Swiss-Prot record, chain B:
Organismal lineage: Viruses, Riboviria, Orthornavirae, Pisuviricota, Pisoniviricetes
Any coiled-coil regions, as ranges: 7-49
Domain of life of the organism encoding this protein: Viruses
Primary role: Subunit of the fusion protein that is processed upon entry into the host cell. Mediates fusion of the virion and cellular membranes by functioning as a class I viral fusion protein. Contains a viral fusion peptide that is unmasked after S2 cleavage. This cleavage can occur at the cell membrane by host TMPRSS2 or during endocytosis by host CSTL. In either case, this triggers an extensive and irreversible conformational change that leads to fusion of the viral envelope with the cellular cytoplasmic membrane, releasing viral genomic RNA into the host cell cytoplasm.
Whole sequence portion shown: 943 to 991 of 1273
Gene name of the record: S
Organism: Severe acute respiratory syndrome coronavirus 2
UniProt-recorded name of the protein: Spike protein S2'
Resulting phenotype, residue 27 to K: In strain: Omicron/BA.1, Omicron/BA.2, Omicron/BA.2.12.1, Omicron/BA.2.75, Omicron/BA.4, Omicron/BA.5, Omicron/BQ.1.1, Omicron/XBB.1.5, Omicron/EG.5.1
């Protein structure tokens, strides 16, 4: 979607392997602010939104 | 209220201890008030801050 009408998708009731996101080199920018990229596989979350 | 003088000392000590423990729940401008959450959520360069 466009930036004025950005698409928000809810992520819930799933087990997420974030290691495929860190190890992929396809992303020019992979920058996290409130959480470490390498610790994402060790924590539990709710209210995940993309 | 006969024994108010002892009760004031006991109340002041308990209140000071209670406030001291309550100060642990304040983040003081950090992202969280829990150290374990910071250790589990961040890398050492931001964790030191």
């Amino acid at each position: 979607a466009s930036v004025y009408a950005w698409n928000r998708k809810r992520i819930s009731n799933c087990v997420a392997d974030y290691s495929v996101l860190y190890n992929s080199a396809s992303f020019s920018t992979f920058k996290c602010y409130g959480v470490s990229p390498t610790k994402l596989n060790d924590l539990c979350f709710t209210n995940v939104y993309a | 209220s006969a024994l108010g003088k002892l009760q004031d000392v006991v109340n002041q000590n308990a209140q000071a201890l209670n406030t001291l423990v309550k100060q642990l729940s304040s983040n003081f401008g950090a992202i969280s008030s829990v150290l374990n959450d910071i250790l589990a959520r961040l890398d050492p360069p931001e964790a030191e801050v």
